[PDB]
Design a protein around this ligand. Structure first.
Ligand code: NCD
Ligand code: NCD
Ligand code: ZN
Ligand code: ZN
Ligand code: ZN
Ligand code: ZN
Ligand code: ZN
Ligand code: ZN
Ligand code: ZN
Ligand code: ZN
Lengths: 362, 362
């Protein structure tokens, strides 16, 4: 007996095209999404070239329309030079992404004044998301208040961060957040097995107390999002390991395992992988789109999942219960039992759909 | 320049059919919905016969399928005799409605033990909503905790209630709520004009401080819902006035006026009349469905709106800015500039759509 889920949405993925296609491309990363029960992805802008201007966005749109197998929206990235220049193209993006800490990105921002300039110039009705760790969460919240608008915090990883966000929500402030599976299912206790190269990720793996705090504060977590961040094993284990884990293919199995154990409900999961992504990013419905899962199937995560070009996973050896059996996307069988059945280019840019524009006052 | 909104959802309406069709019927009440920019309604069970058993639900379903012009879901009502009897039909309903205070209903419940029995027997994945005023909010929240599940509070009207819910949300409890337009836009100050018969409503009109508290605590309000509760003028002004206001045709114009004044954003409105109704009640998308509004049109609410058989309104004389110009429902023009263009029976029971079933574990 299979359970029918709606089309799940991952608001934080790295698909590496353009410029990093040995790590992943639209075709492989969206194959990984479908096999993970994800029918729509929002792709981050820290590509090569980075998606920080209209020409780069135009290139990325065509690459995605030609390669993606599931539907998508593309983020724009904030830079030290582009505030006030994105107004014509802003509504065509998923949102604007700010990189406020050190990670796998060249998109620095040297001053909180540059953050303020982005919050002041980006259209006020369109999403802003931030990589903002520890005190940076409080700092970007201050900027959001000074400019009288909302902010969404990416990959919340620490007790410190979730409690800060909790306090802000208690004061009625417009902040939402997401949490990635590795910050719920891995911790410092896994660093010995992973080793120092594989274990590199930003935000770093937290303590057991960090993990426990995120679970205890599930009500504060608006979304789950993988932060699928593929790099090859050679890169992860070489002389300058880049931070990040692949995660599209493992996210839903890990979370289904937790549902089966009573750690959260099926509804809690569907709020965080479907309804709340829709409402925070004003992402449209996908007609005739659903995911069939088998909640009884027990299996062990292998050394690499089938699709991501990362060809490794930090969750190797974990026992899970729940698997994706079938995905239907806009009336076509997209995935069955390990076979992707829609070609590169089947996926579409949801921001071009009439129902995918973010509503605004004239 | 018109603004395109998604199809709005009203999770709390009284359509009076069966048994009260001089006040409203499915055809007139859903005409009123469309003219108010509402494309899906959830109809309360305090009809004659009340929708408290499978035969009554079967009757109501056929009446709604034949009369409704927009899409709908039907609530079941809790009674003193039906706990544990609704399991076969529960998933076909919008949810289960508990009447916990005195109002226009015969659906009493004499004991909190009966509340507990409903919370214990109703399927745990399906919505429960309550008419629960003042301390009754705290009491039903206690029952929800004892039985380890969620509850949604209907028509929150008082500072006392919104602050209680706020405290519960700060403790991570699974409670949501809605607010009706008359508790945002009318107060004790309007009782002299309305008079004692027209002014009868449950919850009663609040003080200026109650109204101010709901506005100040907008972040706590998950949904707007009209509690469209039509009665004729003769009934409202006769010897035993029933409580309730019609409200489908005035809700969106009143709220658009508030958006235009900067009291809440367009997004705040769309969360509360579209995204949050969807996610709390697991209501499906409506394909090719949207509402076009004119935000500049100023007008004064007349003594009765065109469609509701109530043929009166408590908002008469209020100046509003914003009007519904066009509604498209599932690819057909449903409403233009005062003309309803879909017949009775165009609307469908969204719980019968494959995408309209509430997901559950096997
Ligand atoms: N999280 C990571 O460790 N790496 C991400 C970037 C990010 O989300 O910061 C990547 O793109 O590799
Ligand atoms: N609110 C009212 O005053 N009346 C409503 C019932 C209700 O929502 O309690 C009605 O059905 O007339
Ligand atoms: Zn990041
Ligand atoms: Zn993110
Ligand atoms: Zn990232
Ligand atoms: Zn939206
Ligand atoms: Zn009521
Ligand atoms: Zn209600
Ligand atoms: Zn009611
Ligand atoms: Zn749902």
């Amino acid at each position: 007996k299979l359970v029918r889920l709606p089309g799940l949405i991952d608001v934080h993925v790295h698909l590496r095209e353009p410029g990093g296609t040995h790590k992943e491309d639209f075709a492989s990363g969206t194959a990984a999404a479908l096999a993970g029960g994800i029918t729509m992805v929002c792709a981050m802008p820290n590509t090569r070239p980075p998606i920080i201007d209209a020409p780069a966005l135009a290139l990325a749109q065509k690459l995605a329309e030609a390669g993606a197998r599931c539907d998508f929206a593309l983020f724009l990235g904030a830079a030290s030079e582009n505030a006030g220049t994105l107004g014509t193209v802003a509504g065509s993006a998923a949102g604007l992404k700010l990189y406020l800490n050190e990670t796998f990105s060249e998109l620095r921002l040297d001053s909180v004044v540059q953050w303020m300039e982005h919050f002041e110039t980006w259209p006020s009705h369109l999403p802003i998301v931030a990589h903002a760790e520890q005190q940076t969460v409080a700092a970007v919240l201050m900027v959001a208040q000074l400019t009288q608008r909302s902010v969404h915090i990416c990959h919340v990883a620490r007790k410190e961060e979730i409690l800060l966000i909790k306090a802000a929500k208690a004061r009625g402030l417009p902040v939402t957040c997401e949490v990635a599976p590795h910050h719920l299912f891995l911790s410092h206790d896994d660093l010995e097995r992973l080793g120092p190269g594989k274990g590199e990720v930003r935000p770093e793996l937290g303590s057991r107390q960090d993990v426990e705090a995120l679970w205890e504060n599930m009500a504060v977590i608006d979304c789950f999002a993988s932060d699928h961040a593929p790099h090859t094993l050679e890169e992860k284990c070489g002389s300058r390991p880049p931070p990040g884990f692949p995660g599209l293919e493992t996210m839903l199995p890990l979370l289904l395992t937790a549902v089966s154990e009573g750690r959260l409900s099926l509804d809690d999961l569907l709020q965080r992988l479907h309804h709340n992504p829709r409402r925070i990013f004003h992402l449209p419905p996908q007609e005739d789109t659903y995911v069939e899962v088998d909640l009884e199937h027990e299996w062990t995560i292998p050394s690499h999942m089938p699709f991501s070009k990362a060809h490794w996973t930090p969750f190797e050896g974990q026992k899970v219960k729940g698997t994706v059996r079938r995905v239907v996307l806009r009336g076509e069988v997209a995935y069955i039992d390990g076979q992707v059945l829609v070609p590169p280019g089947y996926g579409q840019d949801v921001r071009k759909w009439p129902q995918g524009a973010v509503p605004q006052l004239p």
